[PDB]
């Protein structure tokens, strides 16, 4: 599994987006395009996240 750490807050704009806060750890579910990935948060919510706002987390 791949997890990322949010570097910035993301409020979301489109219905499909997953909003998150700086420091949130998100699971990556799939990578449909280079800069937008499908992720899930600890509350079970799913949606698209901007790849430039996150960092690999180990």
């Amino acid at each position: 599994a791949e997890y990322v750490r949010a570097l910035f807050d993301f409020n979301g704009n489109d219905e499909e987006d997953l909003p998150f806060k700086k420091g949130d750890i998100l699971r990556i579910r799939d990578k449909p395009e280079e800069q937008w990935w499908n992720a899930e948060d600890s509350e079970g919510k799913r949606g698209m996240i901007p790849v430039p706002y996150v960092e690999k987390y180990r």
Partner: peptide, 13 residues
């Protein structure tokens, strides 16, 4: 590093 611009959404796989 600052904060990078929000990326455009493109055609998906």
């Amino acid at each position: 590093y600052g904060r990078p611009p929000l990326p455009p959404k493109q055609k998906r796989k």
